């Protein structure tokens, strides 16, 4: 219950967390309230990557202590947010907004997560596509080696049963040809 | 690259499926094919018996 | 194909006319003579001389063996793979739209959270300098 | 009129009566098998035997174009359309993954903001209590 | 409508070969089988 | 796809469930009003 549930909802997140860079960015945020929010968020990522290790995450990450709190005043904070609710947007409105977002930046552009709304630099976009393409090509020959090895394994496992089928098909073809010859002979002989 | 990635992922998934459940399907396919072979063989044997019967009687 | 009663390929495939289920003549002659012409699996009465019918396999067309490389098998594989990929895309779009809807809700509640934390930060601040001024004045 | 699952005209249309929604029969039965009989978009169960309702209408006269009156053009058309659809699937999967990462970071900010609201509420409460005690101890003129 | 009587059997399984696991492999098999059977149809026509 | 009454695309498509037959809503409403709730093609009572 002390641990956050937002990362308990798996939705595959980053195995590597930089406490120093995250805290530096949080302190460099000009807004004080949002800076505190990002600072405690950086503490949250540090806590998550420290005490909950993902497969591939480095071990031995140092956790950060958090002061204890109460669920009643947590519900009070949630009530403050809930009374600060405005009107909720319609799902059709949200779908139209994201469709306009897709049309402005198409499926590849929104699929690439390095495209912030403030990134108008063509050189930075080319560098992002280059790094993503390098990682993609790494995936290409890794999965190609895996698939080729597995296909070779199943080939050497199943070729013995594969060889029988051709001979059985040849026998079926010879049988059908002989049957056609036999029925033609049957008709011709019985008439004569 | 993304199209090739999706194609290769589908190929690997089908390869794993054939690894885990392909041998019984291959066996049952070969068994059905040789059953059809047996059906054609008994048909040709019946026609040959008809020819033999006609030839001996005549 | 599988025969119903024997679970194999029937040597003489005979069809029940009442229900259209694939049988083998010897095993169902056994079944009717040992069950008083009762259909297997149902309560219907079957007639071997009127309600049973064999199967004639004409060999006019050169028969292609049932291999996966064949075009009917290949098109069945194409439509099955299209079925699987389209249902996967449909699911992925379903939780994508769900995630985008709760994303809009999450962004609006983040804006509300930023508003209330600015308000509470200013309230805590003015409380802190109010306490400081009171402690200075209360000598 | 298009099917809900594919966005296309279904070859064998059926209708979910509970919401009056068109579906394709094979896709919807495969979906029910995979998801333990759950209607798409909703939570309520679907009956393919009773709740589904086929539509009997005239066949759609899809035109066969003069360029696609030849099997090479048919083969490259199927090739390009399959490539485009599988690229669409990969891009929407990457979009789902990246928006899941964005929502992960967003909710990190959200419960961090909740914790900052929590801590500042505690600090405001103790500051108010200390100021009330100070005003009680002091003599207001 | 009446003289046609369907049969109630199971799905006959055709085993996927090791080579034909990718979509391009299925496509080249599609072209090869198409060539083989149109050649068979042609040769059947002239031998007839 | 075409409507079963006018042979065009229905702007508000409805389906008679008892026969599973597509109709346009306004056309089927006026036809049921004219012929006392009778579906086209059949002799059963169709409820608008």
In short:
Chain A has 192 residues and is mainly alpha-helical. Helices cover 69% and strands 0% of the residues of chain A. Chain C has 139 residues and is mainly alpha-helical.
Q: Can you tell me about this structure?
A:
The structure is cut from a larger assembly and holds one copy of chain A (about 190 residues), one copy of chain B (about 60 residues) and four copies of chain C. In chain A, about 70% of the residues lie in helices and about 0% in strands. Chain A is built from six helices and no strands. Chain A starts with 18 loop residues before the first helix and ends with a helix. Chain B has about 60 residues and is mainly α. The radius of gyration of chain B is 23 Å and the shape is rod-shaped. A three-stranded antiparallel sheet of chain C has the order 2-1-3. Chain C has two helices and three strands, in the order E-E-H-E-H. Classes of the chains: A mainly alpha (about 190), B mainly alpha (about 60), C mainly alpha (about 140). The PDB classes it as splicing/rna. Keywords: Spilceosome, DHX15, DHX35, gpatch1, splicing/RNA, SPLICING-RNA complex. The entry is titled "Cryo-EM structure of the thermophile spliceosome (state ILS)". Chain A: Putative pre-mRNA splicing protein.
Number of strands of chain B: 0
* Spatial shape of chain B: rod-shaped
- The assigned structural class of chain A equals mainly alpha
Query: Which series of helices and strands of chain B comes N to C?
Result: HH
Rg calc of chain B = 23 Å
Helix count from the secondary structure assignment of chain B: 2
What structural class should be given to the helix and strand makeup of chain B? mainly alpha
Oligomer: part of a larger assembly
């Amino acid at each position: 219950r002390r641990r956050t549930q937002v990362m308990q909802r798996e939705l595959p997140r980053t195995a590597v967390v930089d406490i120093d860079a995250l805290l530096r960015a949080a302190d460099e945020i000009e807004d004080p309230a949002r800076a505190l929010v990002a600072r405690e968020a950086a503490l949250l990522m540090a806590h998550d990557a420290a005490k909950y290790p993902l497969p591939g995450a480095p071990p031995g990450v140092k956790p950060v202590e958090i002061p204890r709190f109460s669920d009643d005043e947590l519900a009070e904070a949630r009530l403050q947010i809930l009374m600060e609710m405005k009107e909720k947007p319609a799902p059709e409105v949200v779908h139209a907004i994201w469709n306009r977002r897709e049309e402005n930046l198409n499926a590849l552009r929104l699929g690439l997560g390095y495209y912030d709304s403030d990134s108008e630099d063509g050189e930075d976009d080319v560098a992002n596509i280059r790094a993503t393409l390098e990682a993609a090509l790494d995936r290409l020959m890794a999965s190609a080696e895996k698939g080729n090895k597995l296909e070779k394994k199943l080939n050497l496992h199943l070729g013995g049963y594969k060889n029988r089928a051709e001979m059985l098909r040849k026998k079926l073809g010879e049988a059908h040809a002989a049957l056609e010859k036999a029925r033609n002979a049957l008709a011709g002989f019985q008439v004569l | 690259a993304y199209t090739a990635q999706a194609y290769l992922s589908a190929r690997r998934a089908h390869l794993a499926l054939l690894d885990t459940h392909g041998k019984n399907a291959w066996l049952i396919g070969n068994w059905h094919l040789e059953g059809e072979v047996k059906a054609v063989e008994k048909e040709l044997a019946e026609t040959k018996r008809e020819i033999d019967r006609v030839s001996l009687a005549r | 194909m599988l025969c119903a009663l024997s679970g194999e390929i029937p040597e003489e495939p005979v069809v029940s006319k009442k229900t259209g289920v694939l049988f083998e003549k010897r095993l169902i002659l056994k079944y009717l003579e040992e069950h008083n012409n009762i259909e297997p699996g149902t309560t219907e009465e079957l007639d071997p001389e009127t309600d049973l019918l064999p199967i004639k396999t004409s060999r006019v067309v050169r028969p292609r063996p049932p291999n996966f490389t064949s075009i009917p098998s290949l098109l069945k594989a194409f439509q099955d793979e299209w079925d699987a990929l389209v249902l996967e895309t449909y699911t992925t779009r379903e939780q994508l739209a769900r995630v985008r809807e709760e994303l809009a809700t999450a962004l609006y509640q983040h804006d509300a959270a930023v508003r209330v934390i600015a308000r509470l930060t200013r309230e805590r601040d003015e409380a802190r300098e109010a306490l400081a001024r009171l402690t200075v004045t209360g000598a």
